[model samples]
Structure formats: structure tokens, C-alpha cells
Target chain A: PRYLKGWLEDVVQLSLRRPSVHASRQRPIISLNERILEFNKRNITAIIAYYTDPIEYAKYMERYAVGLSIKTEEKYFNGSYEMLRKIASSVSIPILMNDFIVKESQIDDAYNLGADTVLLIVNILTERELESLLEYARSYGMEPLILINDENDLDIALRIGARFIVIFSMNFETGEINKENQRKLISMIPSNVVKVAKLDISERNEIEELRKLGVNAFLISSSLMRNPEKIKELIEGSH
Target chain B: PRYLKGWLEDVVQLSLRRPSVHASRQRPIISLNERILEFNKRNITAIIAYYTDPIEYAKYMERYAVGLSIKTEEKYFNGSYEMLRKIASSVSIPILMNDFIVKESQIDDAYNLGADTVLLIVNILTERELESLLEYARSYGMEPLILINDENDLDIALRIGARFIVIFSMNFETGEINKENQRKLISMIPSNVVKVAKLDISERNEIEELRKLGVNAFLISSSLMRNPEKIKELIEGS
Candidate 1:
């Protein structure tokens, strides 16, 4: 929470200052929604994995993950555009260019770098900012995931007709995880929308419990990062 | 001016996001004011050079310059904190970390990276921002150069009791040089405070003319950058 506001502010500045020139890549865009739904139809829990090193992490995650969330915030997260480019080219699964979305130029930057999805935090942007960014992402044929932290954020997501909504379990102010809150918010989301749970998920039981609650996917990072083989366990146990 | 506001805004964001951690260096803080005055005392024109490459340019400029100004704004200027550290250690002359500074954290960043001075633009910062930054720089034993664009900016410079005031010749909005305006503003600055002229000076006569008008130093970049030998010509011509 101490770093959340400053981190978001820093993100906006970087977005505004990001270079307009981006080198072209030949990789085709993949659909994040379709990937998650494919896993769901087979009765397996979908995992959107994250890591700093694109090639190594992405190459491994490609086998087990439905999608990859590549953090591109350089200062705090140690993410970079180069990582996004590498992962986008190296992996077969859909990749999310994870960053604090504030400007439309950033979405353009992401799309050019080969992102299948761009993150839009409902807590960070105004309704107008969120709506315009969502439109801009769609224009580039990229799905934008709307990250909601509370009921108010959910209201904004519904108002904007967001198709992909991520319910974050951690409170931005206190840095505490509340799965009860995540479950409550995810349950509220329309079944037609893809519901993502970004929580401190590590165990297979946690995934099963959330799956029962209608959670469509899990954005798992630290736990899986420490022991990547856990992905196999989570995948095999889901059936 | 199209890029000025956006550039400044981007700088603020970078500064705020810049990590608090900095590796300490062993370079001693040299006095930029003393270096300029030393050149003046010898009846030679003082040139504070600017360049992107730190080690190569700083080594070259150390031979002819009173000081060196290293641009650290990465997006537009193609500069970085690493460049500042490299130049600071490579050169004996004082180094000014040239940036669109809005926060005190940047000054701390500059100092830790071995800068003798940090730049504060009058056109970019509010009075309160300027005042606090100046105080913060002084607190760290680093002198800050206040960049003034026009007469009103000159008023703010004087009111703040700025020791080193740089009269920028080009207008931020138009990107056009106005030597006459530079002359008027430089002349208005008190004799005691150091007067620095940032202008498009290519020939020796330009430096001589400004020298006669009490301009203590010249921040010559692109012109002298093209011809390093021009520093000798201007120094000898003065």
C-alpha cells in the first residue's frame, strides 16, 4: 500500500514519456479469453503465470499455463519492454503486458510489442480514462483486463461492460490479502464475463475452492515462481 | 514548446519512480563557481560543455572546459544516471547533472552519482518547488543552477537569491534563439551572482561580445560539440 500510489504515479509518468517509435514484430495476437475457456471446458483450472525473465519462464509456463502476465513496470517490478517482446515471440500461449495503464499511448506501445492483453486497474483510472483505454485496446485487436479491488470498482467494470474482469484479493492500501472479499466480488460478476482471481494462491485446494465459487482463472505468480513444478500439480489435481 | 511541458511532466514521473537506492562514489565535489571564476581571472572565456557520452566527452572536455553539463533525461536526451556517474569519475572539472528537476530526491540522486551541481529550470518548477529544491541542494553541499527563460523568470531568479543564474537564449515555446533577450536578461543579473549564457554560439566573436557584457560562463553544446577545437579558439579569442 505504501508503494501502490507512488508506483501508479511513476507508471503514468513513464507512459507519458515512453518513446513513440517501436520496432515492428511479426508475432500474431492470441486470444486470452479463448485460452481460459479452453481449459475450463476440459475441467482444468486456468493459470496466468508471471515472471521477470521472459524466455525461460515463458517457455516453461507455455506447457501448463493458459496465459502469461508479463509485468512491464520497470522501477518496482523490474519489468521491461524487452521482456514483453521476448516472451511474446517465444511463447505459444497468450501474454498479458502487465502494467499500470493510464495513457492510450501505452496501449499502443503494448500492442506494437506483441501483447494479447493489457491491464486496466479500475482503482487507478477514472471512468472516462478506463472507458477510453478499453476502447483503444480493442481497436488494436487486444483484450484489456479490468482489475477491480472493491464493490465500487465492480460497479465501474459492469457499467463499462468489461468482458474480462480480474478481482484482486490484495487491498491496495494495506497490502493484505482477503480471499473472502475476492470470492464475494467474483460471485457478483456476471457468468458471461470471464472472472479472474489474483490472490496469494499456492495450494491446489485453494484453486478448487475458488473454482467451485465460479472463478474462471487464477493469476498465480510468487508461489509458482518459487516451485514451477507446482503448476503440474495444480493442473493434474484440477480434474 | 510542444515537447517542453510533456518533457517536464515525464521527468517528474521518472524522478518520483526512481529508486531511493544509489551506489556511493568516491569523487570529491569540485566548485563549479570557482572553476568559472578561475577562467575569468585569466581573461579567458569559460565553457561548460555538454555531451551524451560521459567518459569520452568528459575526458575531451576536461582539457578545455571549466565544467561539464551531462544531460540525464533519458526519453528525449538519451541520458541516464549511469552516464552521470561515468562522467563524474572520469573528469576532474565539476559536473552539472542536467535534468528537468522537480523533486528533491533527484538532487540526492545526482549527488550520490557524483554530481557537483544539479539543474533547476525556472520555467518548469513553481516558486515553492524552486525554493525547496535550492535549499535541498545547498543542504547536500551542491550548488544548483537556476535556468531563466525571460524577464519574469529573471525576477524569480533574483527574488530567490540564486547564486548561479543561466540565461537561456532559446524560448521553450518557439525553439527560436533571441540573443538580444539573452543580453538584456544577463545584464540585469547582479554582478556578484554568476551569469551563464546558454546560446547558439558558433563563432569566437559571439563569446567575446557576451564576455564584454559580464557573462561569466557559456554553456556551449552543439556548436563546440561539432568542433572541439573551437573551445581553444574561443578561449584564445577571449
Candidate 2:
């Protein structure tokens, strides 16, 4: 075992191997639906995705919104007061900032940044955490949406008071979702929660079913994060 | 202007309209240090940045550690316990996690995986967070290295008992680390912390002199990630 350390240096950890971050290669990297009709025409409920930093988001696609997390105080501590103002006013779906919740400072950050909706990651938060965050979101005039990863994660959304829910199949590590199973999963959820799926809607078939699921929005560009203008066109023409 | 929204539909969102993710096409992707040497090698102390996610970390080769943030709650998290085992078993130097100090449940995750030490990013932690994480790390017999962005961040490292520290010259967001200033920054830190550079090393002569600056390790990749042959040369020749 002691000599084993000397021998293992020749080994390459598999996680270190580089592969494409996205799976469905057909869609644009940044996408937005101008009207619900595009999703209506396609037959899905909505779309979703996340970016950790805005500058990277800007590089990837101008249409993508900033994914701000509520857990850390390090980011906006610098010059972000002005930066947040400019970024918040630009995007359509607005920024989600993919952060966890516990306090009110985050809600202020969201509103100041001009976020249209607040992403409350239902899975990480407690019942008390959810109640306060959900209420705060409404008090501030921001729509409260729950992020559901599995069936259990979805329960918090229904109980806490979220009308809008985002179902993510995108793994930050993989950036891929199961397109085939996505349709079948969408069918199982209660129709009351306005639903959206992200990361794998690359073809016409999956796209159509998403429409059938009553999707009102689609987060473009895991298909489009690589392209912005065409996504703009697709969003424009889809309706 | 209102019409712009109408134009932003499915037709414009196609993959055909944009550029690839990596800005520079000259180097596709490489994850190992030996391979990163082929690029324009700079004498700035080479930082061996390591992410436990091999695929993500491997894409940029000039990094030194394979950041295995030991928290199981972290996605795909095992603190690179596996990588620590791999690197320690193969090479003499230890790999750093380049992660936060939240819990101790995974510190053992590092040792069992084969790491002699770990990297602690300074900006994220408070005094209490640092103390608890460090107390546990020492209890388990693991060496904790402090990585800092500037003097204020390093002061915390000095206040703590960290013997190994890393200094990064290149900006992580834009990929720009000033070579002369970076060397200057490394010089400013206490000799007690094992000062090193990261993400901007693209040459060999630099590594040779950086060795003179008392840098204990070089975490590199990008080129070696793509070509296995270069790693073969380093392991065999060394």
C-alpha cells in the first residue's frame, strides 16, 4: 500500500477527462420565447436553465439571465450595485441566480437586480426557510418559482405556495437531460403547477410534447448558450 | 424595437449561428501539466489548479490540483479521494481540493483518496468556519494549504496555522494574470506559506525558475489532458 502511492501517479482520474458540456447539440445556447404562443405552438409548459456568473453568461449568450445564489455575500460586496442595475434591466425572463435561501437580503438582491421571478431551490431549504422566502418573494412583487429535481423535491413547491415550477434535468457537471423520459415525466405532474423542463429539448418531437405539457416558457441555449441571434429568431418566429 | 421580440424566435436560436465555447481554438482541450508546457511557457509561478471534476478541470491544463471538495453534499463530490489516491500513488507531491471548508465528514474523504494536503480558498470562509475546518483537518493528520487573492486574504492565512499557501496571478474570469506583478505578488507573501502561481503558465523555462522561488509544486494540464503521450514522458523521465 505504501508503494501503491508511487505506482498510482500513472493513473488519470476519469472525472478529469474533458467532454462537451452540452448533450443536445441542435438547440441554440441562449433562447427566449416572446409570447407564450411559441411554447403553445410547440405544446410545452415552460423552459429553464442557470448560469453562475453574468460575464460568462454574457459571453455565452446575451439573452441568458444571471443565476444569483442567496447563500454567499462575496459577489455583490464589490461594485455590483451599479452592475446589477444594468444587468437586471436587460434580460427578458430575468435572472434566477441559482442560490439557496434563509434570509431577506437575497430577496432584495433579486428585486434590485430586476429579476422577474425568484428561484427558491425547494430541495435544500427547510419548511420554515421556504415559507419565509416564498412570502418575501410575493411581498416584493416577484413571482415565486420552485425548482424540483425529483418527485419528493416537488412536494415542497405544492405545499409552500408556488404556482410556477421549473423541472431541471440539466446537471451542472453534465449539462444534459434525458429527452425521452422527460415527456413521460411531464405527464405525471399535477396540471396546477405551471411546469417547464430544461437542458434536453433539441428535436421537434421532444419540443412538441413540452408544448403538450402546457409549457409556457423554454430556457434556450444549453442548446443556444453557444448562439444568441438565432435563438432570438427562433423565439421570434416560434409563435 | 417591439418588433425585435417578434424576431427572437426558434429560427434565430439555432446552433449554427454561434462560436464554440473555448475562445481560443489553437488549443482544443488538455488537462495535464506536461501538456500545458507546450504552450507559450511563462516564468510566472505555475499554479496547478485542480478541480475534482476531471472533465471540467482537465479542459484547462495549466492548473496544479484536482479540486476534490470533500463535501458529499456537493454535486459529484468525494473530495477527489479517488484522485488523491491516484496522484499520491503515482507522484510524490499531494493534490489540493481547491474547495470550501464547510464540513469534516469529507476530510477523511481526501486521505482515503490519497491526498497529503488540501487547498482552502480564502474569500469564502470566516474565522469560525476556518477554525472548525482546520481543527478537524489536523485531527485527521491532513496538511491544510491556504490559497489567497491578496494581502488581506493572506493575513487570515498568517493568523491561522497554514504552512502551505498558493497565490494566483491570472484573473480567473478573464484568464489574465500579470507575469511581473504575479511574481511580485508571490514575493510579497511570507516564505512560510508555500507560494505558487496558477492558470497562466504556458512554458517550461518558467517552471525551472519558479522552482528557484521556493514553489513546492506545479499543477498543470490543458495540453496533457488531450495528449497522453506527454504525461507518459514526465512520469517515465522523472
Candidate 3:
């Protein structure tokens, strides 16, 4: 429900990331009070995320890592299969996948099918593409992930910027990041890149270890995902 | 204008390939001529081909082998040059580069850009991929030159059932064809396979010699494409 609120408030997190939208904008959140208020206004629950054909879109959503815009679905999710990887990217991150879906229909299909966000890479957007999306968003009042993947991305972000930018880390194309090289790549970027560690840790020990290292935000997927008890455990362990 | 008219006629040809509007079917030529006559009513000399955005649909259309799919632009087309040459295709007949306009904004990108035709190799496509491509071509309107480059590919074309097939004397992938082995393979295939002869016929005499040898089609590119006048002269000589 909380993630749903986050999902509704500007469901499309910008994907100008090397591979991650979270690297660009923190998750969009719907305040609990906003939910209650809207419902009391006899308003729509704002719970339902409208998106285009979600079945194919789900693959894009799951593999939100940067540098690898290759849709995981194409590989049939086989670990070693050779499917299309994202081809074109810009300097804030050299390796990323870019997509173009310009209408509410596009957004609806992309989201409803399971994509939490769509990529604008506004820092790299043309004036027309940028303005059209902006005006359209203003009409629907949806928040998208505003990104600045790196210095150039930052420069573009400052000029043709979005509401916010989360710390990015998508240098590696593969979303799976338990390897030493990925940790090294993360270390290479500036602190302004907001090092939000995905919170896979549930035990107090892992949280303590990460906390002692002074990590910015702990990203949670497995334990905190589909499991509130695990989330409470995470909060307790972190505290 | 003729080229444009022919292109439109190609479009109308595909459009007319649909099932009969009326249940009563007429003779094949009658149907074709009737459609042609109806098409002539619009003061249209020929049906024109339209819609060119293969870059976006390349992945989907690659399976279907129809629709004006194109490259991502030269900057994106930056794959190995070998890959581009491979798009030359070693099929039975000459291959078409299958190139098209990538962007509406950038014009003449392909002719000072190249590749007006598409060539497919039996070896390259599996039965399913090939069949799927032909089916899509039927829908989107494309007539492709199918090349059976090797014995395996030739057998594949025969097995999958194509209307026309060309077996290669020279392997386009390797550029070395075993003449004896190719002759043996050619002997094995049934007469229905289009007996095409493609080789480096650098001079008019060689084209003449090949024509005398009873080749159905000649896949001559460099000689003809390099100079239309020279090709015309060669045609007269032949």
C-alpha cells in the first residue's frame, strides 16, 4: 500500500540512470494522509497504477539496473541467454537503454504492465520531447524520476531539470550486483550520486555492518518486499 | 516516375492478394486484370510503397521480414563493418541490402546511402524464422530474393518450401565455393530450384558465356550498378 502510494504519486521514475531510475529519483511516495484525504474527497483511491500492456513491461520494471537496458524478458529470463542489451546511452552514463513512449497510452501500457517508471533522460532530451512530456505530466500531475546521472547529466539536469534526482549506480549493465567490480564502480562516483544500498539485509549484523560503513539509503527488495514483517525486522535491525 | 509507379503497383499487388470480396472466384488473370483496371480508375499509374520506420520495428519485423525496418542511424549503425558486408547476403539470387530511411528529418541518408533490395540466405534463417518472415512479407508487402548459399541452405530452402530458390556457386560468407561439391549438390536438388548462376563475371564475354550455359538469372552487381551505359552495351553484346 505504501509502495502503491509511491507508485501513484508520479509513478514514472525517470530512467536517465546509467541503469537505475532510483539512481536518479528516490521512489515516488503517496503520503498516508494524501491517500486518506483523497478517499474522503470522494476521489479515486489513487491506488491503481495506469500503464500500457504490462506483461512485456514487467521485464523492464524488474531489471532496473543501469548500463543494461537489455530487456530481461527477451532472454526468457534464462541466466546465460543472449538477448538484446540496451544499445544507445549518453555520458552521464555511457551504457543505458533508452525508450520512447510519448502518450498517456504509452505510459498506461508501460505502467499497467508492471513498469514503475518510464525513462525520459531529460538531461539528454530534446526541447520538443522534454516540453511535450512536461506539459502532459502537468495535465495528469504525475511525478517522474528527475535524473542527473553524472556531471554532464547534472549540467543538463540543472538547465532542463526535474523535481529531484536520486543517487545513481548503473555502470554495470547486469542488474545482479554482488560482485567486487560493482562495488568498485560505486566507489568511483562522487557522493552526490547518493549511494542508496538496496536493502537485502534482514539480520541486525548486515545492517550494522552497512551502517558502520555510513551508507546513505538502504534499498530493500527481498525481505522488505511483499513482507511487512520482514520490513519491521529490517527497521528493528537497523535501529 | 516508372519506378514510383512500379512501387505503387507492388503495394496494390499485395493489397489485391487478399481473399475474395465476393465468394465467386474468377480466373487468376481475370482477377489480377480486374484489380489492375480498378486501380487504374484513380488516374494512378502505379501503386506507391509507403511507411518507412524499420529502426523502431526492426526487432519485430526481422521475424516477419517485411515492413520498412531500418537501422538506428550511422552513429548507431556502428557495428563491425563485417556485419554490414554480411548484410550483402549470400543467397541464391543477389541480395538486397534491405536498407531504408531511418529518420524523416535526415533525407537521402541511405542512397548517398545504399541497399534498395533485400537478400536472404536459407542458411541464415531457420524454417520457422524464414516461414514467419515470408508470411510477414505477404502482409507488409515485400518481395525478397532468396539465396540458398550452401548445400545445407539449399536443402533447407527445399525443405521449407519457397516459391523460388537460388543456390550459390560462391559462398558469400567465405567467398570460396567448391565448384565440384556445388556441382554435386546442384545435381542432387530437383529441377524446380531456380538454376541461377552467380560468379565474378568481370567482363562481357563471361556474361555471354554464362548465358550460353543456360543460367536462369545473373547476379551481376559491380558491372551493372557501376555503369548503366556499360550494362546496356553489354546487354546488346550478349
User: For this target, which candidate reaches the highest lDDT against the unseen true structure?
Assistant: 1
Model 1 residue A214 CA deviation (Å) reads 1.3
With candidate 3 superimposed using the best TM-score fit, by how many Å does residue A44's alpha carbon deviate from the native?
87
Per candidate, native contacts kept equal 0.00, 0.00, 0.00
Pick by TM-score: 2 or 3, better one: 2
lDDT of 3: 0.34
The docking category that best describes candidate 2 is incorrect
For every prediction, compared with the true complex, DockQ reads 0.00, 0.01, 0.00
With candidate 2 superimposed using the best TM-score fit, by how many Å does residue B57's alpha carbon deviate from the native? 75
Instruction: Identify the candidate with maximal TM-score.
Output: 1
Is 1 or 3 the stronger prediction by TM-score? 1
Tell me, what's the RMSD of every candidate? 25.9, 27.5, 25.7
Cα lDDT tens digits, model 2, B1-238, are: 0112222222123211322121111111122222223232443333354333443333333243323222212222343334444444444333444444445644655545555555565655665666667767767565576667665666676667665566665554454657776565564443334444553224534666666554545544333343434542442343
Runs of candidate 3 exceeding 4 Å displacement: A1-239, B1-117, B140-143, B173-178, B181-186, B203-214, B223-225
lDDT measured at residue A64 in model 2 versus the true structure, 0 to 100: 32
Per-residue lDDT of candidate 1, residues A151-178 (tens digit):
8888788777788989886756566768
Model 3 TM: 0.26
TM-score of 1: 0.47
